[PDB]
């Protein structure tokens, strides 16, 4: 029962972002949700003298509908305000718990409330949207975990003392809990924390394993009968890897193609070339030494559709300096589609990025903008939203990262 | 004092009220301001103010006579408000009602109070002739007409006023747009007339006057360029000008009217006309029309000659969209629930780049319908599309970009959408392997394209005013001309590789259009890439050939 003064950055106005059109199904769910939030004092209706807007979406996360607010623009403008454990990637198991309901016990600075304004859209612009602002700390705003921080440390301090090796990291609405324990013990220690949080009034309605995460090695084929095309493709891929690994050579392999040869012609692999290829296979095993994470610089994720439910990704801050690379695969379940797989992959990459570095990456998404803006909420379960942009240039690097 | 509650209003932080000066006025106009203002003063809309008010805003008279005020300075000084009704409803989204009344609200802004603390900033001065005596000072107590916050604060106030009536009458549908009010019910016209008279009284109890000549508007309603009948809607008649010469301004207004007609007139095309605005130097520049542009406008003129009507929306029946190709990169669609009664029509012709294919454009068209359907009806329709699942599944599976395919059904209404060609995924045996390459000096801008094959053939065609990129396409084109029906090409040009791998069937480039014609005629084509200047097979030989 005491507010914490919240200030936007100097010379910065609040967010004025467009509310996206919603289907009548999602509008109805937002109206039910906000009517009950109004009854509980968490939000209140606002008048025309409030010009600010932050977008809202309806997702499922389950049968019951849920509200998600895109506080990205407010988060940039609130920024300022006022700790990431480097060992969370080390732990064999990491479990994620949603602790976001706890924020709704804390009043928000009455002066800052205006910047939390949101609009439930209308169909066909028939009616002006229903407009609310927040009276309590909103889920999804970077300020809410920062303000709730002290209360969180009080509630966790018992549990941390009893289990000193377990690592607990808070990012937005989620708690990341890591242990090197066996899985059954891990899940038991997790339930103790849930009951500890629930005994103290924090309602907490996903298991990762960063032990298995790596940067994938570049893979070269192994063929019984090579052709001119196969050598050319192999010489093309090794040339690309030469920008990254210095020791690659293609002289012996390219000699096998000397002359003007038909592409389908079979080229026996001479011993000198086979050694150079075998040597180049060993160089790809050992990673680059110069790849380091600058905290000031932004993380960037690129994603490539490789077909058959496979998506490759790379995370980097500067070109060719890949901090992480990986491949995503989802076994088709009669509902698997390109937008569902991209949206699942985007979340998996973002979670991995949050564990490793404590910030989300900027996404280069291989999808037409409007298709993404239309359908991304149908499969979104995470409680945060990364920045993104839309690649329109096709990769000819698709083969190489596969 | 007023029953309507005021909205608090501040000026932008660090700004004070307007202090614009009052230019002298004709003595005839001063009399009109004196009479209008004493009538306005009697009604409580304005009030004479003491001398200490340091602010002013100019006022004028023009023609009954009216009072006009220039609040531009206060408007630049006033806080921003939540914008109101940027979009307007689309008649195809509205649902049929048995009875519909239109109600205009008179002196709508002047019926709503204004925040007391803000009233000091509205002050204006009625001039005294020759400045012989001090001027008469007035300030507003209601929402001034032309002020920045008047449109939004009135709508908010109107909504709160309307709230009690709508609770007692849940069945009636009330729409608010600007100063108008649209009321509809499915009750008996006598009972509906009764409910309309009740609301007029409830509005009158809050100070809002309503039409007393029964209800002044009668169907059809001329509303925002539309025509609303009890069982049909249509656009207002469109007139396309005829001129010997066309300026940039004339073209922009023409694509505007055609764009507007597209929502109910099936077949409107504006692509070739709009391409004329590419340079867009000034609205005065005269643009020579194109033979393709003149045919497009002629076909549009023929379409506009016949009338068309749209229907209103029934949420009980399904929503269906069909898309038909119009050629030259242009597409058209209709949205309906009954097989020939259309809710709306539309077009789509954007290339989204220099080269595309039909399946990509069809998927983009489906995307534009899907967004528009959500806005208008809050749902996505069923699609009847002129493509077969084998065609679309093959495309979206091999397409590098992720795409959402709605549930659709194949309708066999030619022209069907097909993949005109498909490059090979593996090299072709028994086919000649062409190693192509091109070049052009960047300064001289002259160049050459040549090939070197496994069968031993070599050729070099000379080239003028080209670029390194265009020659790389020329080399690929040359190998398609001088080859049999099956061919393997090998290039070092990532630029050329990307354009062909995209498998376009249409381009703004005549070269790429020629390559496409060759690719269609050929049976099997495999395109392969090699790093340049790395001494790999024929690429080294063709590089030396075109370098000499
Ligand atoms: N000027 C005006 C105007 C503008 C709009 Cl955007 C709506 C409106 O009234 C309505 C229209 C419809 C759609 C069907 N119409 C009819 O059956 C009779 Cl024309 C339904 C309700 C109302 Cl209130 C009037």
Curated annotation (Swiss-Prot), chain B:
**The record's note on its domains:** RT is structured in five subdomains: finger, palm, thumb, connection and RNase H. Within the palm subdomain, the 'primer grip' region is thought to be involved in the positioning of the primer terminus for accommodating the incoming nucleotide. The RNase H domain stabilizes the association of RT with primer-template. The tryptophan repeat motif is involved in RT p66/p51 dimerization.
Tell me what effect the entry lists for residue 177 to F: 70% loss of polymerase activity. No loss of polymerase activity
Q: What is the effect of changing residue 495 to R?
A: Almost no effect on RNAase H activity. Unable to replicate. Completely resistant to inhibition by BBNH
Give the misc comment. Error-prone enzyme that lacks a proof-reading function. High mutations rate is a direct consequence of this characteristic. RT also displays frequent template switching leading to high recombination rate. Recombination mostly occurs between homologous regions of the two copackaged RNA genomes. If these two RNA molecules derive from different viral strains, reverse transcription will give rise to highly recombinated proviral DNAs.
**List of residues binding Mg(2+) 2:** 437, 472, 492, 543
Gene behind this chain?
gag-pol
Q: What is the effect of changing residue 256 to A?
A: Complete loss of polymerase activity. 25% loss of RNase H activity
The outcome of changing residue 293 to L is: 68% loss of polymerase activity. 10% loss of RNase H activity
Substitution effect: residue 178 to V: 58% loss of polymerase activity. No loss of RNase H activity
Q: Which residues form the Reverse transcriptase domain?
A: 43-228
Q: What is the protein's given name?
A: Reverse transcriptase/ribonuclease H
> What does altering residue 431 to I do?
Replication slightly delayed
- Outcome of mutating residue 297 to S: 59% loss of polymerase activity. 8% loss of RNase H activity
Reported effect, residue 222 to A: No effect on RNA-dependent DNA polymerase activity. No effect on RNA 5'-end and 3'-end cleavages
Effect of mutating residue 395 to A: Almost complete loss of RT p66/p51 heterodimerization. Complete loss of polymerase activity
Tell me where in or outside the cell this protein is found: Virion
Q: Impact of mutating residue 161 to L?
A: 80% loss of DNA-directed DNA polymerase activity. 23% loss of RNA-directed DNA polymerase activity
Name the species this protein comes from: Human immunodeficiency virus type 1 group M subtype B (isolate BH10) (HIV-1)
- Effect of mutating residue 223 to A: Complete loss of RNA-dependent DNA polymerase activity. No effect on RNA 5'-end and 3'-end cleavages
Q: What is the effect of changing residue 147 to Y?
A: 58% loss of DNA-directed DNA polymerase activity. 42% loss of RNA-directed DNA polymerase activity
What changing residue 434 to V does, per the record, is: Slight delays in replication. Virions contain primarily p51 RT
Catalysed reaction, written as an equation:
Endohydrolysis of RNA in RNA/DNA hybrids. Three different cleavage modes: 1. sequence-specific internal cleavage of RNA. Human immunodeficiency virus type 1 and Moloney murine leukemia virus enzymes prefer to cleave the RNA strand one nucleotide away from the RNA-DNA junction. 2. RNA 5'-end directed cleavage 13-19 nucleotides from the RNA end. 3. DNA 3'-end directed cleavage 15-20 nucleotides away from the primer terminus; DNA(n) + a 2'-deoxyribonucleoside 5'-triphosphate = DNA(n+1) + diphosphate
